[PDB]
Amino acid sequence: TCPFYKKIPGTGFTVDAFQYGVVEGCTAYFLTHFHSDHYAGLSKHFTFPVYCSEITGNLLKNKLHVQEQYIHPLPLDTECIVNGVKVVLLDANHCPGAVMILFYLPNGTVILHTGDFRADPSMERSLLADQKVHMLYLDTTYCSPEYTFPSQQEVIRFAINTAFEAVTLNPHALVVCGTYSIGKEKVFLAIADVLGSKVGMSQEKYKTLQCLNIPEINSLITTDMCSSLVHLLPMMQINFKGLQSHLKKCGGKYNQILAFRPTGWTHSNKFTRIADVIPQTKGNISIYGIPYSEHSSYLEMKRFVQWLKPQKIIPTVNVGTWKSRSTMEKYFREWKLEAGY
């Protein structure tokens, strides 16, 4: 049964609730972004409206095969009427096509649902700047002060440098990058760019990328592996047994792999900076973990919520245990008392 934090009061709207069957009363099913926890349940056989971004729509049509009539894409940053309710989509700074949604209720209440987001100061000069927000459905993935990580730009610096070093030292080395969903495209796009290559990938992954409206994308990616010295692989596959295996397949064209595993937080964030990172090493294969996050750090989340001064906050992540819920409320109280709302 659909949980209360997936429903919007005073509407027939639900958010990211596709895995329950029909929700009685639900006229519209919003999808924040194309990640399988949030979309679990959609197929070709959905005959209710879905509202989502254009990019999310392309992925629904081409990867799950939903029928063009039932996909209502909406532009961002545009006041749009949806069954006589004003809504806006705003960029969530998560993965491609990920949005937050502003709901303007008839009674005067305003609700922001962040889906998955990485809070950023540029959001403070968006449409949100213009009016008060009474309720906040918040991505709480990293709502605990231990969760720090660097800026995406810091991380992209590290990567561009590492890769470019090795390839210039050894011109027969291959860069690999791990992946299992959309998100984090800037890692491989940046590396390839510095190396003067295209990124090479399987057919399915090429298909997923061609739906994302990246400009000039035809110049940046290929399905021809031979022709490319930045490869993508399944994140399952990024290990010594699977990388050795893959190094076979290239047929003596490269004598060294240098992989990157973009991860979120790991406990080695607690004691080690980005400029002081190292890889595991079993012979000629070197696997880097790099904490490129597409979720808010604790500080980033803290600032956003302290600027927004919501009258009420509804967690959407880590809500499944009483301890997590309790720990989160405490932080919400501190923020509110610090900030005087």
Residue 320 Cβ, how far from Ni ion at the closest point, in Å? 16
State the Cα–Cα distance between residues 266 and 120, nearest whole angstrom: 22
Residue 318 Cβ, how far from Ni ion at the closest point, in Å? 14
Helix (H) or strand (E) holding 221: strand 221-222
Neighbours of 131 (CB within 10 A): 9
Going by their DSSP bridges, the two strands 285-291 and 280-282 should be labelled as antiparallel
Residue 23 Cβ, how far from Ni ion at the closest point, in Å? 21
Neighbours of 127 (CB within 10 A): 14
The answer to whether 295 contacts Ni ion (rule: CB under 5 A) is: no
Alpha-helical runs (H) found in the chain: 36-39, 54-59, 152-169, 185-195, 203-209, 217-220, 240-249, 298-308, 322-339
Residue 55 or 230 having the CB closest to Ni ion:
55
CB 82 within 8 Å of CB 51: yes
In the region spanning residues 37 to 56, those forming contacts with Ni ion, defined by CB under 5 A, are none
Residue 115 or 200 having the CB closest to Ni ion:
115
Residue 60 Cβ, how far from Ni ion at the closest point, in Å? 16
Residue 35 or 113 having the CB closest to Ni ion:
35
Query: Crossing angle, helix 298-308 and helix 322-339, to 10 degrees?
Result: 60
Residue 116 or 185 having the CB closest to Ni ion:
116
Residue 180 Cβ, how far from Ni ion at the closest point, in Å? 12
Residue 76 or 287 having the CB closest to Ni ion:
76
Cα atoms in the Cβ-side hemisphere of radius 13 Å centred on 91: 11
Q: Residue 113 carries which DSSP code? A: E
Q: In the bound complex, which residue of the shown chain has the CB atom lying closest to Ni ion? A: 116
Residue 264 Cβ, how far from Ni ion at the closest point, in Å? 10
Q: How many residues bind Ni ion (CB under 5 A)?
A: 2
Residue 165 Cβ, how far from Ni ion at the closest point, in Å? 32
The separation between CA 149 and the C-alpha centre of its own chain, rounded to angstroms, equals 15
- Give the position of tokens 């449409």: 127
Residue 116 or 308 having the CB closest to Ni ion:
116
Neighbours of 176 (CB within 10 A): 24
In the region spanning residues 186 to 215, those forming contacts with Ni ion, defined by CB under 5 A, are none
Residue 33 or 231 having the CB closest to Ni ion:
33
Q: Show the binding pattern over residues 20-39: x = contacts Ni ion (CB under 5 A), - = does not.
A: ---------------x----
Residue 269 or 316 having the CB closest to Ni ion:
316
In the region spanning residues 87 to 126, those forming contacts with Ni ion, defined by CB under 5 A, are 116
Residue 306 Cβ, how far from Ni ion at the closest point, in Å? 23
Strand order in the sheet with 99-104: 80-81, 86-91, 99-104, 110-113, 135-138, 312-315
The residues of the shown chain that bind Ni ion, judged by CB under 5 A, are 35, 116
